[PDB]
Amino acid sequence: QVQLVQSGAEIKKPGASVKVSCKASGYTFISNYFHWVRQAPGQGLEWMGIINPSSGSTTYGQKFQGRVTLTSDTSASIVYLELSRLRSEDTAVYYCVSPRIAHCRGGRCYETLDWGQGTLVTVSSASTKGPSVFPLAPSTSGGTAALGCLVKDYFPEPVTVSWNSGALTSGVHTFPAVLQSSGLYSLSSVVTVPSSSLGTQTYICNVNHKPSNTKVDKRVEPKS
Amino acid sequence: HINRTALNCNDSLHTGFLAALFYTHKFNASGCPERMAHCRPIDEFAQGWGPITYAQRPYCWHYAPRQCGTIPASQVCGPVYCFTPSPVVVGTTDRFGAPTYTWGENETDVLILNNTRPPQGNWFGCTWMNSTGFTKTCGGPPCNIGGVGNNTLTCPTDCFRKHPEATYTKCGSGPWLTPRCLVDYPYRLWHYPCTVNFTIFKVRMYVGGVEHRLNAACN
Amino acid sequence: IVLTQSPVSLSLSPGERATLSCRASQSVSSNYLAWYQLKPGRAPRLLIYGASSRAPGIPDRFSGSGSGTDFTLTISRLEPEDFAVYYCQQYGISSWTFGQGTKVEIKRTVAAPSVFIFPPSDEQLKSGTASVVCLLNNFYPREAKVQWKVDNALQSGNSQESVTEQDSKDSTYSLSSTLTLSKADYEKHKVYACEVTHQGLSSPVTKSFNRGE
Numbered sequence A: 001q002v003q004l005v006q007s008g009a010e011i012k013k014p015g016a017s018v019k020v021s022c023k024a025s026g027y028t029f030i031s032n033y034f035h036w037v038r039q040a041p042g043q044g045l046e047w048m049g050i051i052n053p054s055s056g057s058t059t060y061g062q063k064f065q066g067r068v069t070l071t072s073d074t075s076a077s078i079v080y081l082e083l084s085r086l087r088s089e090d091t092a093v094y095y096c097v098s099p100r101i102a103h104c105r106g107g108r109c110y111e112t113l114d115w116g117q118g119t120l121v122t123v124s125s126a127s128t129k130g131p132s133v134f135p136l137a138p139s140t141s142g143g144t145a146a147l148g149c150l151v152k153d154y155f156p157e158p159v160t161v162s163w164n165s166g167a168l169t170s171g172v173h174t175f176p177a178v179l180q181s182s183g184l185y186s187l188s189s190v191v192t193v194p195s196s197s198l199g200t201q202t203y204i205c206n207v208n209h210k211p212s213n214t215k216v217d218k219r220v221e222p223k224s
Numbered sequence B: 001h002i003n004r005t006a007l008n009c010n011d012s013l014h015t016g017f018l019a020a021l022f023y024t025h026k027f028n029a030s031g032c033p034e035r036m037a038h039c040r041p042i043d044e045f046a047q048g049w050g051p052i053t054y055a056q057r058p059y060c061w062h063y064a065p066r067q068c069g070t071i072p073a074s075q076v077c078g079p080v081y082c083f084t085p086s087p088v089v090v091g092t093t094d095r096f097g098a099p100t101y102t103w104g105e106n107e108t109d110v111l112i113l114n115n116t117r118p119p120q121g122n123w124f125g126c127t128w129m130n131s132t133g134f135t136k137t138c139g140g141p142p143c144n145i146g147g148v149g150n151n152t153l154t155c156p157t158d159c160f161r162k163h164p165e166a167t168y169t170k171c172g173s174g175p176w177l178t179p180r181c182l183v184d185y186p187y188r189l190w191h192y193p194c195t196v197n198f199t200i201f202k203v204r205m206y207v208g209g210v211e212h213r214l215n216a217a218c219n
Numbered sequence C: 001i002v003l004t005q006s007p008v009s010l011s012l013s014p015g016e017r018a019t020l021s022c023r024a025s026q027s028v029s030s031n032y033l034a035w036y037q038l039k040p041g042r043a044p045r046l047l048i049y050g051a052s053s054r055a056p057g058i059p060d061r062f063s064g065s066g067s068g069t070d071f072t073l074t075i076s077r078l079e080p081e082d083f084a085v086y087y088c089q090q091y092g093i094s095s096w097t098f099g100q101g102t103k104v105e106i107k108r109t110v111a112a113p114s115v116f117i118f119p120p121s122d123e124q125l126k127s128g129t130a131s132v133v134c135l136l137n138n139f140y141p142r143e144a145k146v147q148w149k150v151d152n153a154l155q156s157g158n159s160q161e162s163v164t165e166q167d168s169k170d171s172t173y174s175l176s177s178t179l180t181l182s183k184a185d186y187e188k189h190k191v192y193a194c195e196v197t198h199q200g201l202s203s204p205v206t207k208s209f210n211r212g213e
Ligand SMILES: *[C@@H]1O[C@H](CO)[C@@H](O[C@@H]2O[C@H](CO)[C@@H](O[C@@H]3O[C@H](CO)[C@@H](O)[C@H](O[C@H]4O[C@H](CO)[C@@H](O)[C@H](O)[C@@H]4O)[C@@H]3O)[C@H](O)[C@H]2NC(C)=O)[C@H](O)[C@H]1NC(C)=O
Pocket: B075, B130, B131, B132, B133, B134
């Protein structure tokens, strides 16, 4: 059962090189061509290059000519993408893709596309740093209050936020992190609750950041 | 004439098998040991005797097929090969035998494989690929050669070690000329892909006095 | 070979019907044209190959069509899971090109944001920075303007904002704006205001606080 399995995420500093591998699995008759396409955060999908493992012939897109190298390991059924002189705008999910004939009819056949699961590459000059978690303290009586948690200044993504150990999920919003000019990430998570619960319901936000083993249980209370 | 190939293919089990209809030297053989281990060599079967009468895993020589009938083109992917023992191609017809030329798209299209063993017939057996990449084969009908035990052999080929009259003319049911040899033909590496490293030999076969010059792939 | 999708966005309701377009600068060989559904944080999922062929599992409510230069993807009856971004791709040559996408969001009655402002905590002020957070909660459509005013001076260049995906239960958006100053600047001024402009608001709404009260 065809499966293209790519190597795990990596974080490289600018000017460095990365080598992503894509391993073919589950073929009875192997495919002939392997493409790599890139998807930068926010932007679209971009083709990078094709390799024919049998011949070794590679053809790279411009924009990547001179910094990309497609290589093969036909005995291993592994294809490699190497990007060098890494810039910050090379942060993206890199996908290996391989066409295969799906079906035939009336004398012609039609190819489909099999996809690896994606390899994320983050390019940052930053170093692993856990977050500082500050409260967003509630400001009514029979209305709705907002409270929250500011998870500031960490690297790399991701952090996870939950409320009262998972017992509070409704009304929660954990916003997408923003990248600050310092190269560190920042995020807020908020919840709305009945005003009449303030000073009564205990609200704790549970922040976890595995890259640094940071784990924080911030009580959020109305400010005095 | 290429238009008479039934080409109703659909790789819905995601094997890449349709590639081999076009490109060459692409077969992954890692699974062949576990499959070929299910084919017992002739020596393990029971010696037969008495008069001969006529009775899965089609990559085993001892696979005992059913007689060939008529099959709907919708279930056929690629050329059908029958064996006289010489390899010949059978194309699509309508249900009354008229050749058709629409790649087997029509629901009325069939492949009429109905076989009688030569010399008074057409061919010994046929092999082909169904729509999702399974090798199918028909022919014979194979021979009941008698014998006792649970390792009794329904002979579909030349099994003369186990019965002196179980020759290919008597029992042949497809492309296996002996338990080690099968007819070479342009799609053998697709239909029987585990025979990839078999050696090709020039052979001669006689069927009711007709000489067949053909290449056999043997192991 | 440039592929140009249209419309750029589309607002519809579940059970209604959606029609996306892909027009190609040159003609596309073999009709090797694919459509993908791109949901946030998920790998692109193939919906259609060879212009008209559903991929395995793709429900019957998706169908593709077209030839040469004009291709179309149609969604019969929109379900909740069908709202996303959709990309077209030609692969008739070795040099693949993609379209730039089409977002399909749930259309909904106009809903004005609830606005809250949050002063920096004393814990952060000890460290020398102040972040002021303004929250715009559960609004539609997603166009919203947030302006920070510090002693009535419209700020710029010192705030970042981020928006949630459309909500699976009420189809609203929520937005968070953070203004970051140094403790010293933060202590120079008194009135910190968040001013929100949105369609469901008859006039801009302001939330504010005076530092230290
Ligand atoms: C190409 O050839 C392959 C190999 O022959 C062929 O695969 C076989 O398909 C049949 C039918 O789709 C499968 O048979 C089914 O097996 C399962 C598991 O045992 C059963 O649950 C199924 O039950 C049906 O039939 C019963 C009566 O026998 C009913 O009571 C029941 O409710 C179901 O209707 C059924 O027997 C078989 O397992 C596969 N085998 C393999 C190896 O895949 C394939 O279908 C052919 N493809 C084409 C395009 O024809």
